[PDB]
Design an enzyme around this catalytic site. Structure first.
Site, PDB file in Angstrom:
ATOM      1  N   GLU A  76       1.071  -1.587  -0.069  1.00 31.99           N
ATOM      2  CA  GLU A  76      -0.117  -0.043   0.261  1.00 31.99           C
ATOM      3  C   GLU A  76       1.335   1.503   0.349  1.00 31.99           C
ATOM      4  OE1 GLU A  76      -3.060   0.123  -0.286  1.00 31.99           O
ATOM      5  OE2 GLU A  76      -3.576  -1.772  -0.113  1.00 31.99           O
TER       6      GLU A  76
ATOM      7  N   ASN B 165      -7.459  11.016  -5.179  1.00 31.80           N
ATOM      8  CA  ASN B 165      -8.191  10.215  -6.450  1.00 31.80           C
ATOM      9  C   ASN B 165      -8.844  10.919  -7.467  1.00 31.80           C
ATOM     10  OD1 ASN B 165      -7.287   6.732  -5.810  1.00 31.80           O
ATOM     11  ND2 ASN B 165      -8.379   7.952  -3.934  1.00 31.80           N
TER      12      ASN B 165
ATOM     13  N   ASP C  92     -11.923  10.381  -7.751  1.00 31.41           N
ATOM     14  CA  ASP C  92     -13.516  10.580  -7.261  1.00 31.41           C
ATOM     15  C   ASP C  92     -13.658  11.432  -6.335  1.00 31.41           C
ATOM     16  OD1 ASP C  92     -12.529   9.039  -5.357  1.00 31.41           O
ATOM     17  OD2 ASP C  92     -13.607   7.161  -5.923  1.00 31.41           O
TER      18      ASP C  92
ATOM     19  N   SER D 197     -11.882  11.562  -2.848  1.00 29.97           N
ATOM     20  CA  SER D 197     -11.684  11.116  -2.771  1.00 29.97           C
ATOM     21  C   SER D 197      -9.594  10.989  -2.147  1.00 29.97           C
ATOM     22  CB  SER D 197     -12.138   9.425  -1.594  1.00 29.97           C
ATOM     23  OG  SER D 197     -11.036   8.350  -2.464  1.00 29.97           O
TER      24      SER D 197
ATOM     25  N   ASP E 207      -6.240   8.469  -0.354  1.00 27.28           N
ATOM     26  CA  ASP E 207      -6.111   7.654   0.468  1.00 27.28           C
ATOM     27  C   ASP E 207      -4.794   8.397   1.322  1.00 27.28           C
ATOM     28  OD1 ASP E 207      -7.861   5.776  -1.016  1.00 27.28           O
ATOM     29  OD2 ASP E 207      -6.420   6.044  -2.184  1.00 27.28           O
TER      30      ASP E 207
ATOM     31  N   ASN F  23      -9.122   4.936   2.991  1.00 23.80           N
ATOM     32  CA  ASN F  23     -10.066   6.313   2.225  1.00 23.80           C
ATOM     33  C   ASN F  23     -11.428   6.999   2.823  1.00 23.80           C
ATOM     34  OD1 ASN F  23     -12.649   6.331  -0.233  1.00 23.80           O
ATOM     35  ND2 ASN F  23     -10.561   6.587  -1.149  1.00 23.80           N
TER      36      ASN F  23
ATOM     37  N   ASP G 254     -16.926  -3.575  10.958  1.00 26.88           N
ATOM     38  CA  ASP G 254     -17.503  -3.898   9.923  1.00 26.88           C
ATOM     39  C   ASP G 254     -17.963  -4.528   8.700  1.00 26.88           C
ATOM     40  OD1 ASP G 254     -18.995  -1.769  11.253  1.00 26.88           O
ATOM     41  OD2 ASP G 254     -18.281  -0.288   9.997  1.00 26.88           O
TER      42      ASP G 254
END
Ligand SMILES: [Cl-]
Length: 129
Positions: A35, A46, A48, A50, A52, A59, A101
């Protein structure tokens, strides 16, 4: 901070990740390697909207709040800047929440593509633990 492999393994062990939800320590070290290359300051912005953040590239749409991301859920209940510290505690606490989650480690694309099915014990071999 750029961690060494064995130093990161020891820090992760102290924070309870070995065998957390059935994932051995080497899985977590392998995920961080691919990562972020062990860099606590890594960021990937990103298209979009967002971003990271940090050693585990968590994210901003679902997990932390950066104030700029559409659809924010903030499920770890933290600012994303907390994930850019030299101390790994916030990143580890949020990673535990991601698996709690109802995700497995498939949530990390680099784990699924570069760690799953490999000898992940290699990542802790030779370390003082
Ligand atoms: Cl282990």
């Amino acid at each position: 901070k750029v961690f060494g492999r064995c130093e990161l393994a020891a820090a992760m062990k102290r924070h309870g990740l070995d065998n957390y939800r059935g994932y051995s320590l080497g899985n977590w070290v392998c995920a961080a390697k691919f990562e972020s290359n062990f860099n606590t300051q890594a960021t990937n912005r990103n298209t979009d909207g967002s971003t990271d953040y940090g050693i585990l590239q968590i994210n901003s749409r679902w997990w932390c709040n950066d104030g700029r991301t559409p659809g924010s859920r903030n499920l770890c209940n933290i600012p994303c800047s907390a994930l850019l510290s030299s101390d790994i505690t916030a990143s580890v606490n949020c990673a535990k929440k991601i698996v709690s989650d109802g995700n497995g480690m498939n949530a990390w694309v680099a784990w699924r593509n570069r760690c799953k099915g490999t000898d992940v014990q290699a990542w802790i071999r030779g370390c003082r633990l």
